[PDB]
Amino acid sequence: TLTYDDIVGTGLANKCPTLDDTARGAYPIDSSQTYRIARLCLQPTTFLVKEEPKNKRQEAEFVPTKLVTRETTSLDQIQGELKVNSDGSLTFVEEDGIDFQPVTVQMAGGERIPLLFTVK
Amino acid sequence: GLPWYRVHTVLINDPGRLIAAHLMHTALVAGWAGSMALYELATFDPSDPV
Ligand code: CLA
Ligand code: CLA
Ligand code: CLA
Ligand code: CLA
Ligand SMILES: CC1=C(/C=C/C(C)=C/C=C/C(C)=C/C=C/C=C(C)/C=C/C=C(C)/C=C/C2=C(C)CCCC2(C)C)C(C)(C)CCC1
Ligand SMILES: CCCCCCCCCCCCO[C@@H]1O[C@H](CO)[C@@H](O[C@H]2O[C@H](CO)[C@@H](O)[C@H](O)[C@H]2O)[C@H](O)[C@H]1O
């Protein structure tokens, strides 16, 4: 439905695919059939950064941080074979896609923490 | 000649130039007030309140 001239600028291009409240279904895994994942998307929402130890070994926590970049965070187009090995468990193997994005978040104090948000 | 330590006597009966004077003192104390603040914000470390 929505196209490029339809999404351009809305920043919808960063948020990825939703499922209207109808879900809760069940995708039958055949085991006698090979499954793959067409498109695996990972849309960042919150980034936390464990406060560098105080030196005083007293459980450091993950504090929230401000996103200093823009809406340049999502991972998409990720694909690979969803292998169905014995004992019914599924195993996804990442093959290729836009599986990494350099993100920089400004932390509580003042710092700027650039990380390579990825799932390579 | 008026002595140096009296120069400011020229206001004992000039409610205008007195309010003007007093206005300048206040203005300076505010300057300093925020002035100090900035100096401290430019050097205060908030990393550990313990
Ligand atoms: C509440 C504030 C206050 C105010 C408005 C006045 C006002 C006045 N005083 Mg008084 N005085 C005060 C407090 C005050 N005084 C205090 C606390 C003392 C005890 C130290 C005195 C001792 C005093 C004397 C001994 C004399 C006056 C005189 C005078 C009159 C002329 C001043 C003058 O010529 O300055 C001009 C002054 C200078 C050119 C020199 C300033 C030099 C100082 C050491 C530099 C410090 C600078 C720094 C920026 C100040 C910061 C202030 C600090 C409190 C934060 C004037 C009506 C004179 C008078 O009666 O004349 C007939 C006089 O002879 N005063
Ligand atoms: C209507 C009532 C009234 C009010 C509310 C005031 C209020 C004030 N007087 Mg004034 N006064 C009055 C009547 C009044 N006076 C009368 C009838 C006389 C005899 C002529 C005086 C003589 C007098 C002297 C001799 C002095 C004062 C001073 C001051 C100020 C001291 C505190 C200060 O500096 O805060 C710091 C400032 C603020 C944070 C407030 C800023 C906001 C103000 C209210 C608005 C200014 C804009 C407004 C349109 C015009 C000024 C109005 C004027 C009535 C104050 C304060 C604003 C002193 C001064 O000159 O102050 C520097 C001083 O030396 N007064
Ligand atoms: C309620 C508190 C308060 C009070 C009562 C005063 C009162 C006064 N201030 Mg200060 N002021 C204050 C807060 C206060 N201030 C704050 C928070 C600041 C911001 C830092 C200032 C900044 C300030 C400035 C920038 C100036 C004043 C000046 C003055 C004096 C103006 C009237 C005068 O002619 O004195 C006549 C003079 C005196 C009696 C001052 C001597 C008294 C002090 C306590 C001595 C300080 C010692 C000094 C370090 C020694 C130097 C010695 C020299 C030989 C080298 C008056 C004594 C003016 C001034 O002093 O100019 C003449 C001036 O220029 N004030
Ligand atoms: C417009 C209003 C206004 C406001 C809301 C503020 C607010 C503030 N000021 Mg600023 N300030 C102002 C005007 C103002 N200021 C002006 C005009 C000046 C002079 C230029 C300053 C100069 C100034 C300085 C130098 C400093 C502040 C500071 C501060 C901060 C709190 C400090 C404090 O505890 O003070 C509490 C103040 C008092 C104890 C005042 C009460 C005085 C006595 C007890 C009463 C005398 C009353 C008299 C006898 C009448 C009788 C009373 C009757 C009811 C019985 C606060 C954010 C401080 C700060 O942190 O800086 C960023 C600081 O150091 N201010
Ligand atoms: C020309 C013009 C005009 C006017 C002007 C004016 C109004 C001015 C003012 C001015 C001013 C008003 C000035 C001031 C100055 C100041 C100064 C010069 C200061 C200094 C300071 C200092 C040096 C300090 C120090 C410190 C330190 C170091 C630390 C601690 C704290 C403190 C802060 C204390 C107008 C607009 C009409 C328009 C046209 C043009
Ligand atoms: C329109 C109204 C304007 C009102 C005035 C606002 C001015 C705000 C200035 C506040 C004072 C800042 O003071 C300044 O803080 C920054 C951190 O944030 C410090 O920055 C320090 O840590 C950062 C990392 O976090 C380093 O990259 C920097 O090299 C180091 O100096 C400065 O060394 C200090 O001098």
Whose CA is closest to A39, among A13, A75, A78?
Answer: A78
Question: How remote is the CA of residue B6 from the centroid of ligand 5, in Å?
Answer: 27
- For the Cβ of B22 lying below 6 angstroms from any atom of ligand 3, the answer is no
The residue type of A24 is: R
**Angstroms from A105 CA to nearest CA on chain B:** 18
Resolution for this model in angstroms, one decimal place? 3.0
Does the beta carbon of B28 lie inside 6 Å of ligand 3?
yes
Q: Determine whether the interchain pair A54/B46 forms a contact, defined as Cβ–Cβ distance below 8 Å.
A: no
Q: What is the 3-state secondary structure (H, E, C) of A56-87?
A: CCCCCCEEEEEECCCCCCCEEEEEEEEEECCC
Is A35 in contact with A84 (CB distance < 8 Å)? Answer: yes
Q: Which of A79, A80, A75, A77 is nearest to A42 (CA)?
A: A75
Helix (H, G, I), strand (E, B) or coil at A40: strand
Closest of A107, A37, A102, A52 to residue A74, by C-alpha:
A102
CA-wise closest residue to A80 among A118, A120, A26? A120
Approach to solving: X-ray
Q: What stretch of H or E contains B37?
A: helix B15-41
Interface size, chain A vs chain B, as Cβ–Cβ contacts under 8 Å: 5
A56: distance to nearest CA of chain B, Å? 10
